[PDB]
Design a protein around this ligand. Sequence first.
Ligand code: ZN
Ligand code: ZN
Ligand code: ZN
Ligand code: ZN
Lengths: 294, 293
Amino acid sequence: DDLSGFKKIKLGELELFILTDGYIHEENLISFAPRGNVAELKTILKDNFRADHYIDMAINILLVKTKEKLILMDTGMGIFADERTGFLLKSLQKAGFSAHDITDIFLSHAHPDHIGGVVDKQNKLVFPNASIFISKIEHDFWINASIKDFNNSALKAHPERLNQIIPALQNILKAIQPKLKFYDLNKTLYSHFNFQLAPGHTPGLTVTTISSGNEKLMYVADLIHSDVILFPHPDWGFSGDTDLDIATASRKKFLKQLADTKARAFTSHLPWPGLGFTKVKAPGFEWIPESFMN
Amino acid sequence: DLSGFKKIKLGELELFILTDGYIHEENLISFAPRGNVAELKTILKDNFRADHYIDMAINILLVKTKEKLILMDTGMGIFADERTGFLLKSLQKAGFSAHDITDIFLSHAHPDHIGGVVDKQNKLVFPNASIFISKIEHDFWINASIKDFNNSALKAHPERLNQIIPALQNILKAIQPKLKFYDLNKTLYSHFNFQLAPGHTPGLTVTTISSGNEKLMYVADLIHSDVILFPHPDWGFSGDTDLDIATASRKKFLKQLADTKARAFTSHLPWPGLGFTKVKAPGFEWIPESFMN
Ligand SMILES: [Zn+2]
Ligand SMILES: [Zn+2]
Ligand SMILES: [Zn+2]
Ligand SMILES: [Zn+2]
């Protein structure tokens, strides 16, 4: 019933806490990977002993405790939560923290399942002491977004949904304006964090690298939404991508980079705890989850 | 603090996977006696694992039925090092004390499974629990000698065997008054069925847990590495009492799991030890169960 939880890991100087907001039970598989083969999609699910009539997407969130900061990377569904989501604050509590402890929030992008937790249902800030970072491009996009921005998206099939969600996101952006900062894409922040754009899923989707000594972790957020489908088939796309073609280009760039460098990634939506490695495997890539003893 | 638990549902049953900690094997030469370190290291690197040690989990299953609370194996207990012996802390996190346990099912009598049944004064840790073991397993360790290990990698360590055998015998003596032998031909407590998978030890017992439409197979020490011993089950494991019999059992039960697409629970594969088996000729592949939390 209570879907909250955390996992603590060490990253050199840093303490990391992986938090869960819950999960998304996606039952509409015809458009999950819009450019894919729906027979092959279900074969892959069954070859991995999973259900073939839905895909459960995790909502994994990273909390980073540095020497003087406590940083939350994304905030889950918040006001958009259903009964399977909105567990972030319970997870944070289990990890030993309350909302007032958070000093900084890094938003990877402004989708409902990432920005929803920054306010409550009266548009009041949840994290009273936190600066909130977003890319300038991401902000610029959503404050003026409309239906016609989604013509290269599977979402174009849902204009009524879009016409609901866009003003809701705009209202959140208005509420957080007094806390808002834009990433500097060319400077290290707080000694540990570097930011770069990976456009396509949204125009300003930001990937964060966390560094301590010879340890690096890349939070790639919504670059990829399925371990078993979109690593071998990155050109199949994802239902929520704002621009399918541009999202495919970013997905391929970062998968290639993760494979070439053997770097560990943290992901929003792959199975818990969302940590793993990327290898080339014709005709695409393969996700190798990190292994744990507990 | 390496303690922790995961709760899952199986039909009407509540299952809690508990950790005792982990075993850090820092020398790869002994790990898979009929393999080789170059090929082993290649597999570890190919899976982004450390290439100079292997960590083995110690996963333990707690089953809450409508009238009983069953612990399947007990971790290192009196044999614990700094990374093991966390079972009671995990049990507490899951919501239970030692006094709550009604039954313990031992898969086999190795130190990392039977060590937790007594304390260092050889007093029972679980005062209200019956303890089950296979008759063959019991009779082996009561009567074992060094020569019985001549088809084990453990034959390289006769001093260690001469310490371990009496230590295990002392535990078997302490739990004697609570000890029952499995009936391999009947369902116990409406949920449990037992069968042997000899070789790792002569009386290694595999337990099937069932409720409603669901079944889970606790295969205990059938297999010790997900990435090594599924593709190469004939490489063996350092702790197997008889390497040839253990290989045959390993291949038999991996084939059954593959053919039936059944879920297994394992003592030593990465946390939480749950997963599926697929043929990947000439061997197998482990597909860990995927979770949202
Ligand atoms: Zn998104
Ligand atoms: Zn998302
Ligand atoms: Zn054993
Ligand atoms: Zn064992």
